[PDB]
């Protein structure tokens, strides 16, 4: 059972210390990365799977698991400022937390739990650090492969599933054929749902099902068919993907630094190509602070307010943090 990936003996203890917060929204993944020799995705996934007894439940070899996860992590670009393996580790650990929210207790099968955490792990692999629209506009190889439709999201799925082809890395070897087929369908569904171009419609359909939600006597949501279960799962992974502004301000600020570095790098590439600069990618004019206020007001809060509404009162502290964070960025804009 691996306890360190480096030569620092002090790190083994520090890492296990950080990992005591595995089931908490307040886990600090930057620290995890620091104490794991930059293996946040390998280590958090190993911790999550052991925490949930998923290697035992699905007869996944620890050895095969580590090899697969190391190589998946290696397919995230460490030179991409935001969409790298630390983001993937964060989305996976955040999904692990949402899976345990009391309102959803006993709702999901082990296969659905597995699908959801694996989807989070893979959902941005081999991201080149520019948007779908930038790929479409530049006639990139990916956009020609995917006919301009959910270009990156299709690619992330293709890489994550292609890596399982080699026997040495097939973590799903001992699932049954029907299990593998259902898992693949769920993961494909979840990852494609992370495409921001689908968010307005995802949310609409979410606000819709919150309306007719049936909380049972004991306080647990009744989600009786597959259709309802995969809809909550697809929204959960989406929420996890868009969870940075709901974390402690200390963490949220570090995430903002990264996403703006990535966005402004795209702006530079656009300029360089004589392309039209996308407003929020232009380092010469865009306000980092307004960009987060708007991001929260227009995208993150409506999603989380609706999730919160669905899992009442589970997500109340998340909302308060979000609103506090929103307030902090606003207060950072020098104008009234
Ligand atoms: C889920 O996919 C993404 C991609 C990029 C950022 C985020 N989350 C954001 C973050 C974040 N920390 O998660 C921060 N700021 C954001 C700001 C300021 C804006 C947007 S946006 O309105 O979704 C937007 C507007 C215009 C272009 C693009 C783009 O490049 N892609 C690929 C979607 C994105 C998202 C985020 C999520
Ligand atoms: As670990
Ligand atoms: As392999
Ligand atoms: As994103
Ligand atoms: As942009
Ligand atoms: Mg993505
Ligand atoms: Zn993501």
Structural domain spans, the chain: 1-336
Peptide bond just before 313 cis, omega within 30 deg: yes
List, in order, residues 6 or more apart from 34 with CB less than 8 Å away.
none
- Report DSSP state, residue 71: H
Which residues does the annotation mark as catalytic? Answer: 83
Ligand 6 centroid from CA 13, angstroms: 33
Q: How far apart are CA 216 and CA 320, in angstroms?
A: 26
**Which listed ligand is nearest to 16 at the C-alpha?**
2
Flag whether 124 is marked binding.
Answer: yes
Measured in angstroms, the resolution is 1.8
Flag whether 83 is marked binding.
Answer: yes
Q: How far apart are CA 19 and CA 23, in angstroms?
A: 9
Instruction: Give me the long-range contacts of 50-57 (CB less than 8 A, separation at least 24).
Output: 51/22, 51/23, 51/96, 52/96, 52/113, 52/117, 54/110, 54/113, 54/114, 54/117, 57/110, 57/114
Resolved by: X-ray
Region of 157 (left: φ > 0; alpha: ψ -120 to 50; beta: rest) is alpha
- Which architecture characterizes domain 1-336 according to CATH? Orthogonal Bundle (1.10)
- Burial per residue of 304-315, b for 16 or more beta-carbon CB atoms within 10 angstroms, e otherwise: bbbbbebbeebb
Flag whether 123 is marked binding.
Answer: yes
Residue corresponding to tokens 């026997």: 167
Ligand 6 centroid from CA 242, angstroms: 10
**Which listed ligand is nearest to 254 at the C-alpha?**
1
Which run of H or of E encompasses 215?
A: none
The protein residue whose alpha carbon is closest to atom 1 in ligand 5 is 281
């Amino acid at each position: 059972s691996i306890s360190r990936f480096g030569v620092n003996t002090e790190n083994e203890d520090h890492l296990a210390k950080e990992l005591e917060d595995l089931n908490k929204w307040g886990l600090n993944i930057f620290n995890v990365a620091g104490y794991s020799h930059n293996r946040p995705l390998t280590c958090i996934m190993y911790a999550i799977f052991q925490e949930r007894d998923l290697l035992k439940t699905f007869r996944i070899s620890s050895d095969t698991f580590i090899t697969y996860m190391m190589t998946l992590e290696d397919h995230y670009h460490s030179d991409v400022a935001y969409h790298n393996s630390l983001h993937a580790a964060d989305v996976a650990q955040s999904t692990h937390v949402l899976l345990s929210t009391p309102a959803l207790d006993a709702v999901f099968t082990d296969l659905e739990i597995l699908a959801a955490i694996f989807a989070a792990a893979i959902h941005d692999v081999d991201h080149p650090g520019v948007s779908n629209q930038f790929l479409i506009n530049t006639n990139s190889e990916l956009a020609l492969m995917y006919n301009d439709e959910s270009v990156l999201e299709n690619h992330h799925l293709a890489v994550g599933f292609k890596l399982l082809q080699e026997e040495h890395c097939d973590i799903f070897m001992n699932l049954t054929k029907k299990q593998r087929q259902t898992l693949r369908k769920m993961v494909i569904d979840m990852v494609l749902a992370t495409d921001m171009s689908k968010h307005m419609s995802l949310l609409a359909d979410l606000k819709t099902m919150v309306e007719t939600k049936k909380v049972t006597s004991s306080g647990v949501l009744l989600l009786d068919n597959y259709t309802d279960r995969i809809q909550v799962l697809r929204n959960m992974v989406h929420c996890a993907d868009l969870s940075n502004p709901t974390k402690s301000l200390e963490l949220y600020r570090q995430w903002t630094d990264r996403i703006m570095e990535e966005f402004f790098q795209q702006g530079d590439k656009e300029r360089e190509r004589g392309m039209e600069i996308s407003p929020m990618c232009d380092k010469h004019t865009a306000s980092v602070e307004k960009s987060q206020v708007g991001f929260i007001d227009y995208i993150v809060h409506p999603l989380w307010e609706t999730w919160a509404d669905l899992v009442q009162p589970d997500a109340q502290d998340i909302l308060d943090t979000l609103e506090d964070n929103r307030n902090w960025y606003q207060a950072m804009i020098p104008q009234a």
